[PDB]
Paper text:
While progress has been reported in the structural characterization of various liganded forms of the FeMo-cofactor, on-path intermediates have proved difficult to visualize due to the high protein concentration and homogeneity required for canonical X-ray crystallographic techniques.
The Fe- and MoFe-proteins are both inactivated upon exposure to oxygen, with the Fe-protein being the more sensitive of the two4.
Author numbering:
A (entry chain C): 4 to 481
B (entry chain D): 2 to 523
C (entry chain F), D (entry chain E): 1 to 274
The structure:
């Protein structure tokens, strides 16, 4: 658990690699040291993955279609390219929404151009135009269209921008071309950036000359919340009870109309800094809308964030925030009193994507658990700077960890619980360690606010204290 | 608010009054949603014949397809070999998606690697990526064989798998003797089953083509079994059990049964039992080769007939009664082993179950979809059972397969109301089940949404889904079921009859309204 | 100001050398001209930089990791007469994808300013074999507005010009790009002037200039520099200055009208013999 | 026999016409030859077929859906001397991806026989800009075993030949394909023969022949026919006959030895002036 032991473990794990792979991978494993916020602490991120090492990262298409654009309900998102890309991405994420699917909401559906050989050889711009015409014919109540590119689209130089412009002018529809080819970037982060750029270029400035919207001194926009299991609703009920008027949600149970109405708000409450800081900064520079980060994981973080948000408004909002915190205090007090004795002192290792490896630490600490290791898939150095103040001393930090690295680290540290994605769940359940899916909340949730903290504590207790983990070893063996 | 004693997850938490009011206020204030009357009108329109004709006039847009890309099937084929690592040459997002798909279907670890080709590799080629990835994979995960597939990005730019692997071996990145079979699997050609075919042909050609001089047909007194793209472990299990019970020497090539059903005993085995390299090398010496799924094993059949000089029998998938009988009879003819009494008793028990459940099964109307061979066998079994497969859909089918299924349907009186669709997706099937309503629909988990749609038109228009096929995501441990042989026929029969009985029990549960038919004995 | 031209034509017809000599003449006229090579062969800016510049966009993006870590000053250089030269990188023949490299280079140049300057002219020297949409990138909406085709009396050259006009048709209908004219670099064909004039009339465009085949151009290219720098008093230098003046004063921008195969066969059966 | 050769070179250097005339010379010699045009423009088999071949593999596959539904007869045509001619399809310039089309066409030819016949020579005429692996497809394992590069005295042709050798190296290392020799097409440069022979020596290869630049080829091509067919008594017909004889009798097949930019520059400075 000491620094020297963790460093020796790092070297032992890296020993198996070839020289080039070892030299690269040494820079992505580190031992946490607070009061040190930079990339000097032998941790670098946002780099190319080493080939043939079973990485967990996705593509820019996943970061654009699957993350930023897909949860938008009244919009048809077309996976332009071969089949498969959109089939694996179909309904795999739990961005919850309200609507009549197939007539006015299209989050679950899968629209694609289904490229063949002739589409590759002769191009697919005419096919894209015909596809847009058919989409308009068969789904009248769609409020917009987005065209998410895949790898061959970017290779063969298809002009989706011209088609989008012409068809939008012809049908008076908003068509957003996203050049989220999978080979672009090194992970989903470039997909986040490209999606934010497309939002800025094609959707954000639509209502610039419109002043019919009624502004209020209490206008806020929720940024970077994708409503995984209902998280955005759980946050929104708190924010609306404490006095604000949440105009927009970016981009979970969210519509194109509230995306266009975001430039009218007074404050931008950013949850996922990694995926949406670009559009937050753009709105700050253009419309002069301040943006502040907030955390709604666990009672401590949500109380602190609520007070910080209320500090930005008049004293009435702060008074209402005090009332809402007082009202919700006994519920989470009961939850901690029920579940903390069962989970006190348990050690957790996490490996999630760009924001959650550091945001969920407060909720785990509120339950008496210690996070003895964390890592990111696609986070940049600002994410690690934020993380280093939240994570314990002499604790493992990993960037774009490999399957072998994660397996060896878990074998040596021997945690009580691991929070990662679907591609490691059964690996670590085989080894006998309780596993919690921290992407989709293991098909449960929400985990935001106090209403989400109750479910979070219940799920952690359910998985950690299940009797199945006591039966891994057959009685006739030792 | 949450009661500590009774904690509510998203359902039914978001049915609370405060959440309902907040959601209504948000929708009314900032969503600019169409009025509910307009939405209802549009939905009712979508469930009509005019909408069906507009939907079937589609030529460029695909909505809710039922198929995947070739590298998924290539990975599944590569997983069936002993200590073999699937290696997709291309971009990493593809491999992440493949692993997530197979993890969600099998609830098992799925090992596959990528060389993580990027913009730089897209422009300059991925030969350096190939060398580095092969060396890293062999050093780290220590496989006995690396099977290389391709991503659409590498297929577009024309990356030469053979040249890249040869340069990797000649520059010392991997041993010259290490087996690295490869296959070109373009995602814009065919589907996942085509990728399985391509990968198996590549492995067979890697291990057999050069060493054809010393091979004699029938030397090892075995029958090669090529199972194709299979996602039911019970299918491999039943094929092996039937062949072993019959006393037949067999060589099941690309067996992934062990690696997809690893025991949980506190130890993680990345590799489990599969087809050995010795089996693959000795395969030409077998008496013959039987293809379990002949409608997506065309390239493999061509290679086996042209190189190994095996006369591959013209057998259908051993699904149902008649086709299992033909499969067993052909195996007996090829190997000379008589069919044992155990298989005769199993066939008799299947016939007995058919006889017992015929009254409930007869006349039922089914929509269904899946892969070509699976769909063909399911239609054959349904015709044997006396059911009516009204809507037969196969996205990855062709004209020859459609002709074969049409000939099968025309041979039975129960195929009069059946139409076969190729190149149609699940939006087409949603229109069909709205217009020509069947009793049930048999398919993967993606049909659940279709069922939901029907329930929105009314409880009397709902078409229940029976989950048989791939992928099955919303149910647990259904991949252990059997589909092939008499055992699979019994399992499918039980599932169908009990689904019918469950629906009938649900429809007659209303006391004083319809409970006069809530019969204890059925 | 801020004119934008692309140079297309049959492979090996002399697009690169003619473009470089035109650019040198324009710079001699005191104009500020930029040149972008859209060829995987990084040979479009040699005669201005007096060297095969190794600072191509794609290989330096490789050295810097991603394209997002690339800076304009790193790959942009100045040459003879203050001409700015940028080269799009490319793979070795028979590997990779050059169209993607051209797409990436053009997108990088657009994102990081580059053309957001006071430059009068921006030239896009494109390769002979336009085989994908990547090599038509200079012909997109906010890119080169006028296209010049370099051709010669050979019928494969005119078939290439016809095919390139067929390609230009789609990007002209969807944009504001137009065919300025046809440049003729003579290959000592028998009836070259009449043949190229007839082809231009059939396509609806005009003969902008005629460039005689002079070995002074090859001699200059051996010395890594243009005819203007090699021999300011040569007749070929005068012809290049006349061509530069013509393109400066050109005003006929017409959507191409491609002809069929049989029409071309008749064109050179009547205008190519005797 | 069944010798498979691939014709590469700089764009517009004359690979297509030289290949067609060579194939016709072989046809007069009693050899069974088949040409395959790996170019988006179907201009590589016009001379043998006396017309543009409209039955290209990729276009007919697009018309009939998938290339699997195609058949060899619908695309394989015979011409002068019984020379079978096959052409790969391709999109109009500036759209699609021609390399993928070439890959698909070659795979279709390989599956449906074509090569497996009594042909003595199988030629693959490739375009001048090999921008991707699709146009290196004829250089794969069981494809063209000899590569002939068409060069000229102009420096750009020399640099293109060096670049093409650089690209060839990665396929020659991993396979049995070898650079048979350089073919020189005259373009009236000063020291043509000296430059070509020096570049061949530096590359480690040989000059197969020196084809003179004569106007008869323009007249023969205008008539949509080969020079040997147009004027068997002409001097250029004798030169093409000698080129055919030397190609048939070539036994030198080596892995190319590419030279860097500085070596080519110094070679050209020494051998290209005066
Ligand atoms: N007007 C001309 N006079 C003499 N030689 C020329 C002329 N134009 C081109 N050339 C020769 O032809 C070759 C053309 O090469 P290049 O400009 O790269 O062709 P492209 O760029 O059109 O493929 C050059 O090497 C040059 O020596
Ligand atoms: N030896 C030669 N002498 C004179 N002209 C030639 C010669 N070889 C080819 N040509 C001319 O080149 C034109 C065809 O060029 P093409 O074959 O398309 O070039 P490449 O195949 O080298 O790219 C013909 O019109 C012909 O007149
Ligand atoms: S968007 Fe990002 S990988 Fe910020 S791509 Fe990923 S629904 Fe993760 S850690 Mo899946 S940067 Fe969201 C994420 Fe975090 S899909 Fe979800 S859980 S908070
Ligand atoms: S990195 Fe990302 S998911 Fe991969 S392809 Fe590229 S955009 Fe898509 Fe697509 S059809 Fe299948 S899954 Fe690929 S091999 Fe192509
Ligand atoms: S034809 Fe163009 S888009 Fe296709 S692989 Fe070659 S360079 Fe890339
Ligand atoms: F041969 Al080039 F641009 F150098 F067409
Ligand atoms: F033979 Al070409 F451009 F037609 F080099
Ligand atoms: Fe399991
Ligand atoms: Mg050039
Ligand atoms: Mg040619």
């Amino acid at each position: 658990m000491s620094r020297e032991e963790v460093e020796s473990l790092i070297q032992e794990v890296l020993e198996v690699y070839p020289e080039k792979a070892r030299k690269d991978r040494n820079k992505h494993l580190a031992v946490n040291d607070p009061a040190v916020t930079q990339s000097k602490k032998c941790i670098i991120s946002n780099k190319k993955s080493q080939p043939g090492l079973m990485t967990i990262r996705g593509c820019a298409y996943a970061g654009s279609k699957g993350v930023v654009w897909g949860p938008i309900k009244d919009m048809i998102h077309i996976s332009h390219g071969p089949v498969g890309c959109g089939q694996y991405s179909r309904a795999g994420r739990r961005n919850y929404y309200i609507g009549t699917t197939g007539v006015n909401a299209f989050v679950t559906m899968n629209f694609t151009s289904d490229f063949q050989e002739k589409d590759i050889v002769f191009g697919g711009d005419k096919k894209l135009a015909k596809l847009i015409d058919e989409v308009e014919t068969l789904f009248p109540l769609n409020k917009g269209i987005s065209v998410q590119s895949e790898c061959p689209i970017g290779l063969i130089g298809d002009d989706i921008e011209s088609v989008s412009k012409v068809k939008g002018a012809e049908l008076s529809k908003t068509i957003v071309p996203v050049r989220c080819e999978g080979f672009r970037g090194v992970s989903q982060s470039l997909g986040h950036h490209i999606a934010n750029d497309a939002v800025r270029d094609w959707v954000l400035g639509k209502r610039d000359e419109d002043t019919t919207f009624a502004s209020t001194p209490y206008d806020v926009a929720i940024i970077g919340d994708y409503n995984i299991g209902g998280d955005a609703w759980s946050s929104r009920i708190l924010l609306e009870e404490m006095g604000l008027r949440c105009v927009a949600q970016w981009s979970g149970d969210g519509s194109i109309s509230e995306i266009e109405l975001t430039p009218k708000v007074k404050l931008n409450l950013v949850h996922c800094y990694r995926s949406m800081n670009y559009i937050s900064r753009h709105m700050e520079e253009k419309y002069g809308i301040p943006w502040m980060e907030y955390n709604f994981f666990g009672p401590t973080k949500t109380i602190e964030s609520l007070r910080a948000i209320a500090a930005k408004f008049d004293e009435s909002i702060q008074k209402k925030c005090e009332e809402v915190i007082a009202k919700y205090k006994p519920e989470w007090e009961a939850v901690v009193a029920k579940y903390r004795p069962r989970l006190e002192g348990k050690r957790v290792m996490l490996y999630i994507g760009g924001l959650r490896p550091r945001h969920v630490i407060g909720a785990y600490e509120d339950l008496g658990m210690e996070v003895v290791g964390t890592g990111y898939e696609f986070a940049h150095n600002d994410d690690y700077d934020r993380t280093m103040k939240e994570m314990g001393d002499s604790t493992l930090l990993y960037d774009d960890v490999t399957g072998y690295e994660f397996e060896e680290f878990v074998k040596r540290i021997k945690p009580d619980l691991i929070g990662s994605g679907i591609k490691e769940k059964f690996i670590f359940q085989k080894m006998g360690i309780p596993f919690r899916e921290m992407h989709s909340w293991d098909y449960s949730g929400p985990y935001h606010g106090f209403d989400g903290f109750a479910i979070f504590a219940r799920d952690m207790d359910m998985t950690l204290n299940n009797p199945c983990w006591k039966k891994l070893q057959a009685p006739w063996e030792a | 608010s949450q009661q500590v004693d009774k904690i509510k997850a998203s359902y039914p938490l978001f049915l609370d009054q405060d959440y309902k009011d907040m959601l209504a206020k948000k929708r009314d204030g900032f969503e600019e949603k169409y009025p509910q009357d307009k939405i209802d009108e549009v939905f009712q329109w979508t469930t009509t014949k005019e909408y069906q004709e507009l939907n079937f006039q589609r030529e460029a847009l695909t909505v809710n397809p039922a198929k995947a890309c070739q590298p998924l099937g290539a990975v599944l084929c590569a997983l069936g070999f002993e200590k073999t690592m699937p290696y997709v040459h291309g971009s990493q997002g593809c491999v992440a998606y493949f692993r997530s798909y197979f993890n969600r279907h099998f609830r098992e670890p799925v090992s596959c690697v990528s060389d993580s080709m990027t913009e730089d590799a897209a422009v300059f080629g991925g030969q350096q990526n190939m060398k580095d990835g092969l060396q890293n994979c062999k050093a780290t995960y220590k496989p006995d064989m690396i099977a290389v597939s391709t991503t659409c990005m590498a297929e577009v730019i024309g990356d030469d798998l053979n040249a890249f692997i040869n340069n990797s071996k000649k520059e010392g990145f991997i041993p010259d003797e290490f087996p690295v079979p490869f296959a070109h699997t373009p995602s814009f050609v065919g589907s996942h089953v085509t990728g399985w075919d391509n990968m198996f042909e590549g492995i067979a050609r890697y291990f057999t083509l050069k060493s054809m001089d010393d091979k004699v047909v029938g030397s090892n007194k075995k029958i090669n079994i090529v199972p194709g793209f299979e996602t039911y472990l019970g299918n491999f299990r039943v094929i092996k059990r039937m062949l072993s019970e019959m006393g037949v020497g067999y060589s099941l090539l690309s067996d992934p049964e062990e690696v997809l059903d690893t025991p949980a005993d506190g130890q993680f085995r990345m590799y489990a039992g599969g087809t050995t390299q010795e089996e693959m090398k000795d395969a030409p010496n077998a008496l013959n080769t039987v293809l379990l799924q002949p409608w997506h094993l065309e390239k493999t059949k061509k290679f086996v007939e042209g190189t190994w000089k095996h006369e591959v029998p013209k057998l259908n998938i051993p699904m149902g009664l008649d086709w299992t009988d033909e499969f067993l009879m052909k195996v007996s003819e090829i190997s000379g082993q008589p069919i044992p009494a155990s298989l005769t008793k199993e066939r008799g028990r299947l016939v007995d179950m058919m006889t017992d459940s015929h009254t409930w099964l007869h006349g039922k109307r089914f929509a269904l979809w899946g892969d070509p061979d699976f769909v063909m066998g399911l239609v054959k079994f349904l015709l044997e059972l006396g059911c009516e497969p009204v809507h037969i859909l196969c996205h990855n089918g062709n004209k020859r397969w459609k002709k074969a299924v049409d000939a099968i349907l025309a041979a039975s009186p129960y195929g009069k109301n059946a139409t076969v669709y190729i190149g149609k997706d699940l939006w087409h099937l949603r229109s069909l089940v709205f217009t020509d309503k069947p009793d049930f629909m048999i398919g993967n988990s993606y049909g659940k949404f279709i069922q939901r749609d029907t329930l929105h038109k009314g409880k009397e228009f709902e078409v229940p889904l029976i989950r048989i096929g791939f992928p099955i995501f919303d149910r647990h441990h259904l991949h252990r079921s059997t589909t092939l042989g008499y055992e699979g026929a019994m399992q499918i029969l039980t599932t169908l009859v009990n689904s019918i009985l469950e629906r009938l029990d649900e429809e007659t549960r209303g006391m004083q309204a319809t409970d006069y038919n809530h019969d204890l004995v059925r | 100001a801020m004119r934008q031209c692309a140079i297309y034509g049959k492979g090996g017809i002399g697009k690169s050398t003619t473009t470089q000599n035109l650019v040198a003449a324009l710079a001699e006229m005191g104009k500020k001209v930029m040149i972008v090579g859209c060829d995987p062969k990084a040979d479009s800016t040699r005669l201005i930089l007096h060297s095969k510049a190794q600072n191509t966009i794609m290989e330096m993006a490789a050295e810097a990791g991603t394209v997002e870590d690339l800076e304009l000053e790193d790959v942009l250089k100045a040459g003879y007469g203050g001409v700015k030269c940028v080269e799009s990188g490319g793979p070795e023949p028979g590997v990779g994808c050059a169209g993607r490299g051209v797409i990436t280079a053009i997108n990088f140049l657009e994102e990081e300013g580059a053309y957001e300057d006071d430059l009068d002219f921006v030239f896009y020297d494109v390769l002979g074999d336009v085989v994908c949409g990547g090599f038509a990138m200079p012909i997109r909406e906010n890119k080169a507005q006028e296209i010049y085709i370099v051709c010669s009396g050979e019928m494969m050259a005119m078939y290439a010009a016809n095919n390139i006009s067929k390609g230009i048709v789609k990007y002209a209908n969807s944009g504001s790009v137009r065919l300025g004219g046809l440049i003729c670099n003579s290959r000592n064909t028998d009836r070259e002037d009449e043949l190229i004039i007839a082809l231009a009339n059939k396509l609806g465009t005009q003969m902008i200039h005629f460039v005689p085949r002079d070995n002074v151009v090859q001699r200059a290219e051996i010395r890594r520099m243009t005819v203007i720098e090699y021999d300011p008093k040569a007749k070929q230098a005068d012809e290049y200055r006349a061509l530069a003046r013509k393109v400066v004063d050109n005003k006929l921008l017409v959507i191409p009208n491609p002809i069929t195969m049989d029409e071309l066969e008749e064109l050179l059966m009547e205008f190519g013999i005797m």
